[PDB]
Structure formats: C-alpha cells, structure tokens
C-alpha cells in the first residue's frame, strides 16, 4: 500500500571507551576543559595548544596531560599497548 | 639552417674526414683532425645550439635528433654536461606551468603523469640511460612540483580515488597495477604526503561506507604499496579501517544467530559496521527523527554489541548512513539506494503529500547546510523522483515538493546515493584545517621523540633530522614557535650557553 518501505539498512557507529564520565583520565578533569598544567598558569602559558590526542589503545587523553607520561613510561596507562599516538584532535 | 640538419652535416663531416684518415690520411692525423673538427662544429657552440635548438626538440618528441644530439653532445668538452643543464631547466619550466595555475588543477596530475612519460621515455632511448640524466630528471622534477605547496598531494589523492571508485574503465588487473605503480613513482617526488593521508583516508571510509570499489585485493596493493616507501604508522590508521571492516562483518553474523532464535517480526534487514573512533576520520553526529521502527532495530544491536563488549560507548552516525527503499509507482515498483538523509525526506510522501522546505525541515530534523543538497537531487538533478514548484536551479524556503509520477527508467535499483560521495567545499577546507592543525604537534611530538634519543643536539643539526622523519616541511617560524613550547614546558634546554646546542632535560 504505502507508496515506499525500507528493505535493507546500513547503520554506521563509532566506538570509543566508557571512561566515567569522560575525563581528562590522566588528569581527570574532563577530555575537553584546558587541563591542570595549562588550567593552572604555572610558568607554562601554552592552554592554545591543549587538545585530545588518541592512541592506538584507543582512549585519548589531552595532549599535554600525557606527553607528560611519556617521559618517564611509554604504555597507554590504561592499556598496556604501548602509546603510538594516531589522532589529535577533539 | 635548422638544428636537427645542422647536428647530421656534423654526424656527416666526422663521417668523411674519419673515412678520409683511412683512405689516404696517416693514422696518426687521426686524433688533431678530428679534434680540431670537433672544436669548431660542437666545442664553440654548445650554448648556442642547444639555447635555440633544444627546447623545440623536447616539447615536439624529436627522438631521433634528440639522440644523434647525446651522442654528439657527448664527445665534447663539456658537452654531455651542457646537455644536462638545459634538459634540466627545461623539465622545471614546462614543469612549472603543470602545477602552478590552480585554474588548470583538473588536468594536474594526469598532465604531470604523462610528461614524466615522455621525459622517461626519452631517457630510455635517447640518453641510452645514462644514469646521470635520471638523477636530474628525478632531481628536479621534485624541485617544480613543490614550488606548489599542498595541492599536488590533495589532487594526486583525489586522482587515486577515482581509480578505485565504481567502474568499467578499470576492468584489467594487470594494468591497474600498472596505473597504479606509475601514480605512485609521481607520489615519491611530493612534500606533504600527510595532506595524502589526509584527503586519502577521508576518500577511503567514503568508498568503505558507501558503495563499492573496484576490487578489494586491489584496494589493498595500494596499501601495502604505501607501507613500502613512506612508513608503517603513515598507513597505520587505514590498515585499521579495514579491520573493523572484517570486526564488523564477524559481530554481524552473531547478532544474526542470536536474533535468529526469536520468531522474529522485523521487516527490515539492517546492517550495522562498527568503526574505531580513533582511526577514522573526524564525523560530525546529527540529530534527525528515525522512524519508530528503526530506533527499535538501533537499540536491540546497541544492547547486543554494548554487552558481549563491555566497556565501550557508541554513537550513531547518521551522515553515513544509507538504506534501499522500495517505490510504488505507475508502471512501475523500482527500490532505491538512497542514503539516510534521503530515505526521511521521502517517507513522508507515504502519509503525506505535496510539502514545502520548511515544513520538511521541521518533521525528520536535517540541516538547511545539507537538507538543501540532500533536497538538490530528489528534484533539480536529473529532475525525477519529486518536483519543486518554485523550479530553479537551487533550494529557496517555500518551494514544495511533489511526489512525482514519472518513471520510465528501464531500472530497478537507482543509485539517488551519488550526493553522499561528493567532498563539498566545506569538508575541504575542514579536512586541510585538521592537517595544518595537526602538523604542530607531529612537529612537537616528534622533536620530543629524538631529543631523547641523542641528551644534547645542535640546532640545525636537529632541523635536518625533522626534514628526515616528519611527512611534511615545517617553516623555520614554526620551529622556532616549537622549541619555545618545549623550553616553557620543560621537555627541554639551550645549555653550554650557545643558542645553537639544545640538552634533553628529562
Ligand atoms: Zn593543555
Ligand atoms: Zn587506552
Ligand atoms: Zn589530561
């Protein structure tokens, strides 16, 4: 009767981690608010250039809190996939 | 007289007074006579011939006389050294012109394709090979495609793309190797492959998502194509585009057997393919009204992925959606391949009849941005499936829609999808924005990288590492601007008290 139905449908969706309630994780704030080295004006004055980066884990983390973890350790401290950083930007 | 008729009266002259020492000539004469010929039909005058001679000979493909020219050239002083020069200056000038007029953008890289072949092509017979020709040729053929900062990469991209896309005129593997080995010895010669990846992969997930390709084995050359000669985290993101393809294949079919064992009632066969956020490009979600019925199908797969994978989130993305409609018509009952956004504005013709823009805005939910476009075919392109009363060009506010009566296409299964594979002006701008915008902390993340590396480092004997390991070239403004960064932060130092030594500082 009606005029057109629906006989197939492809659906697209993307996936990312449920990280309680999506925070800076290394930081904990939140994924997308400065972060606490540039939320705090300490002798580091750069809060421009504070985005997401994501890794091959998959979780993002602000690029800054984490280019930081870096020094010391080198593994998605959440993951044990060693950081490899394949993304920035929110 | 000419050129190509002056070099063959010297072939000629050279000829006689050679067979000249064997007829009554002493052997030894030989060597200061011909000398001496030579240094007056070629050694005083190299310049002179090739500077009005040379040029008309290339852009004209005088193989011959280009031949006979390398041999002779080649006997002189400094002939086959003159030679290349002007060759040279001669690639870069017609080179230049390719790639310079954004006006002729379209025929870029297939006219780039094809010199390289008619330069080769004279190298092999022409030059008999000589290797020092191929490294100018090479050298300087990588000096005038980067006097073009971005596009050559974006267009070679875009070039690929149509390569791969849905169609006839590829229906040879042994040749699309071949089209494809060739693009990609232009590739090598590019400076900012990162803007390749860049449009490449927003080409590919387009071409995953929507529509097929080619072939798949042959999709995936190209890849393993790129891994060769560029890196294995150049092509990281892409090889994993592909697997979620493969994820999202094997979780379909579970959810399948699963929802075998229900006595079923849906009417619609969904499938759903699942990305991983971060290897894909960047989407943009958007709020639309879906049908009842689908919101149902949606959430029973939510609830099947969410559990069975604990500790994941989705998100809908509506813009890639797609979907194939079935139409009851007159004299016909065609189905269509129409994407989400197409498939709501439709649907409401089934209840309805007879609607205006905005009215349709309202009941589905799209944007003016797209609703237009989306709206654009439907009607206006190819003018077939509804009708716009106020009939123009474009999408105003009050134009209605009617559900048109036509039909006489001798198909079933049309393709209205040709809108969803289309990079409008805005998506370019934005995917140059997220590369630029991008390029700042590659350049940051990778001074950090080889700081460690080797504690303490000159500075221009850093810069020249960059220009090894990063895909792109990296003002000195912006380097300056980096280190900065990296000194406030403390990542780290100019010590030893010499503004050109930098220590790590861990
Ligand atoms: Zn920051
Ligand atoms: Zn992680
Ligand atoms: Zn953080």
């Known amino acids: ?90 | 007289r000419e050129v190509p008729e002056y070099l063959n009266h010297v072939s000629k002259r050279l000829e006689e007074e050679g067979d000249r020492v064997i007829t009554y000539l002493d052997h030894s004469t030989q060597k200061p006579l011909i000398a001496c010929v030579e240094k007056q039909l070629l050694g005083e005058h190299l310049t002179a011939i090739l500077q009005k001679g040379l040029d008309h000979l290339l852009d004209e493909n005088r193989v011959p006389d280009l031949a006979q020219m390398y041999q002779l050239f080649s006997r002189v002083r400094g002939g086959q050294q003159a030679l290349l020069q002007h060759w040279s200056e001669y690639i870069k000038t017609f080179g230049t012109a390719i790639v310079i007029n954004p006006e002729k953008d379209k025929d870029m890289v297939q006219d780039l394709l094809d010199f390289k072949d008619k330069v080769d092509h004279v190298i092999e017979v022409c030059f008999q090979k000589n290797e020092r020709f191929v490294n100018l040729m090479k050298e300087s053929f990588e000096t005038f495609i980067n006097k073009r900062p971005n596009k050559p990469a974006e267009l070679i991209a875009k070039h690929v793309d149509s390569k791969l896309r849905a169609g006839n005129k590829e229906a040879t593997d042994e040749e699309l190797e071949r089209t494809l080995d060739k693009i990609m010895i232009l590739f090598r010669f590019i400076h900012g492959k990162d803007v390749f990846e860049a449009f490449y992969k927003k080409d590919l997930a387009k071409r995953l998502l929507v529509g097929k390709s080619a072939s798949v084995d042959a999709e995936k050359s190209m890849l393993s194509k790129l891994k060769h000669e560029c890196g294995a985290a150049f092509t990281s993101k892409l090889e994993g585009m592909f697997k979620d393809m493969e994820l999202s294949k094997d979780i379909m079919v579970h959810f399948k057997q699963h929802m075998q064992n229900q006595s079923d009632s849906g009417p619609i066969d969904l499938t759903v393919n699942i990305l991983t956020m971060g290897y894909w490009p960047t989407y943009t979600p958007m709020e639309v009204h879906l049908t009842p019925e689908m919101i149902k199908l949606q959430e029973v797969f939510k609830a099947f992925y969410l559990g069975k994978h604990s500790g994941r989130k989705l998100q809908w993305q509506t813009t890639l959606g797609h979907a194939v409609l079935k139409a009851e018509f007159k004299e016909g009952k065609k189905e269509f391949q129409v994407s989400l956004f197409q498939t709501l504005v439709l649907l409401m013709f089934n209840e309805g009849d007879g609607f205006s823009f905005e009215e349709i805005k309202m009941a589905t939910g799209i944007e003016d941005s797209e609703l237009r476009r989306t709206l654009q075919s439907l009607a206006c392109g190819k003018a077939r499936v509804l009708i716009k009363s106020p009939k123009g060009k474009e999408v105003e506010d009050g134009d209605k829609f009617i559900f048109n009566g036509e039909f006489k296409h001798k198909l079933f299964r049309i393709k209205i999808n040709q809108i969803q594979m289309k990079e409008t002006v805005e998506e370019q701008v934005s995917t140059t924005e997220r590369v630029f915008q991008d390029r700042q902390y590659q350049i940051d993340a990778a001074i950090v990288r080889i700081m460690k590396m080797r504690k303490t480092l000159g500075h221009n004997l850093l810069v020249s590492e960059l220009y090894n390991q990063l895909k792109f070239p990296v003002k000195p403004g912006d380097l300056k601007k980096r280190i900065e960064s990296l000194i406030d932060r403390d990542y780290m130092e100019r010590d030893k008290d010499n503004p050109n030594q930098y220590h790590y500082v861990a």
Request: with cysteine.
């Open chain 1, 1 to 90: 009767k009606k005029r057109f139905e629906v006989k197939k449908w492809n659906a697209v969706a993307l996936w990312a981690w449920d990280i309680v309630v999506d925070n800076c994780a290394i930081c904990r704030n939140h994924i997308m608010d400065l972060c606490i080295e540039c939320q705090a004006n300490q002798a580091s004055a750069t809060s421009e250039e504070c985005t997401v980066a994501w890794g091959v884990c998959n979780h993002a983390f602000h690029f800054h809190c984490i280019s930081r973890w870096l020094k010391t350790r080198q593994v998605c401290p959440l993951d044990n996939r060693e950081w490899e950083f394949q993304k920035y930007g929110h």
